[PDB]
Amino acid sequence: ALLSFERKYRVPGGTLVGGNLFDFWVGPFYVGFFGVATFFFAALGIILIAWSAVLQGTWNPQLISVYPPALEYGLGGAPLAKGGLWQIITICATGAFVSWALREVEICRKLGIGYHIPFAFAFAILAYLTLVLFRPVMMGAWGYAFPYGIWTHLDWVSNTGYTYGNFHYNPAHMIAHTFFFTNALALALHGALVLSAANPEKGKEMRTPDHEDTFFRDLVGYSIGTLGIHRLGLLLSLSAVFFSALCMIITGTIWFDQWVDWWQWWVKLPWWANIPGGING
């Protein structure tokens, strides 16, 4: 298993830890110390989950669910079958992700490329952790965190959401949202532009970046450019996930009432608070 151009790149070096010990491949996969780190953390995790599945007495993926220790146990540990398993698995998953990232930093180094991929990943890792570590620890219990199950974690979302009314009203969530919808729009567009250039009307020549720049300038009066759009996707993406963490770190900590109500700060401003008419008085 090698891509036809692959061999020249498979040189020794790059590794962050272990010298050359785990400096090798298995099929397409690069290993690394953090390949081993990953496999360990990953296997032990799936092993505890497969077990928590029998202490719960079920072998269906749509039903398996590993809940955090209930609000009682605080920020302390818990006997396995009613808590601890979650905690250990959560440790395992953080192990597994951080390892994966560090492994990518190793692949980066061997390839002479920059760190932009595992840097981006670190934003997803931080989002996870926000929900399972930073939010709970600030709030006082592993119980506020989400359970590990397909449909059960959606329950937690709906239940956490509705605890503060219609969650839409969270302003940081409002921002994060905008970024998810923009990033998708940019994705749709970017993909289409490049393909519309490489795959022109039957019989015609491949178009150029100038045709890309022109098409947009025609369409909207602007064009961000083949460097820009790649800077842009990355910004919309990470920005979405940034405000995602923000919107949830501030919910149940600095603000814990109905989100809709926060918006009265604007309405109850001196110079218009008591003017007659409109929707508010």
Chain residues that interact with ligand U10, rule: CB under 6 A: 26, 29, 31, 35, 38-39, 42, 174-175, 178, 182, 185-186, 189-190, 193, 212, 216, 222-226, 229
Residues within the interface to ligand BCL (CB under 6 A)? 46, 97, 124-125, 127-128, 130-131, 146, 150-151, 153-154, 157-158, 160-162, 166-168, 173-174, 176-178, 180-182, 241, 244-245, 247-248
- Site mask, ligand BPH, residues 207-246, x = CB under 6 A? ------------xx----------------xx--x-----
Q: Which is nearer to ligand U10, 104 or 144 (CB)?
A: 104
Min dist CB 4 to ligand BPH, Å, is 23
Separation CA 33–CA 252 (nearest Å): 39
Could you tell me which residues are annotated as the binding site for (7R,8Z)-bacteriochlorophyll b?
153, 173
Q: Which is nearer to ligand BPH, 230 or 268 (CB)?
A: 230
Using CB under 6 A, which residues numbered 5 to 64 contact ligand BPH? 38, 42, 45-46, 49
CB 254 within 8 A of CB 171: no
HEC assignment per residue over the chain: CCCCCCHHHCCCCCCCCCCCCCCCEECCEECCHHHHHHHHHHHHHHHHHHHHHHHCCCCCCCCCCECCCCHHHCCCCCCHHHCHHHHHHHHHHHHHHHHHHHHHHHHHHHHCCCCHHHHHHHHHHHHHHHHHHHHHHHHCCHHHCCCECCCHHHHHHHHHHHCCCCHHHCHHHHHHHHHHHHHHHHHHHHHHHHHHHHCCCCCCCCCCHHHHHHHHHHHHCCCCHHHHHHHHHHHHHHHHHHHHHHHHHCECCCECCCHHHHCHHHHCCHHHHCCCCCCCC
Residue 114 makes contact with ligand LDA by CB under 6 A: no
Q: Which is nearer to ligand BCL, 65 or 244 (CB)?
A: 244
92 phi and psi, to 5 degrees? -50, -45
199 contact, one of other proteins, ligand BPH, ligand U10, none, CB 5-8 Å limit per kind: other proteins
172 contact, one of ligand BCL, ligand LDA, ligand BPH, none, CB 5-8 Å limit per kind: none
Instruction: Catalog residues that contact ligand LDA under the rule CB under 6 A.
Output: 1, 28
Instruction: Catalog residues that contact ligand BPH under the rule CB under 6 A.
Output: 38, 42, 45-46, 49, 89, 92-93, 96-97, 100, 104, 117, 120-121, 123-124, 148-150, 153, 181, 184-185, 188-189, 219-220, 237-238, 241
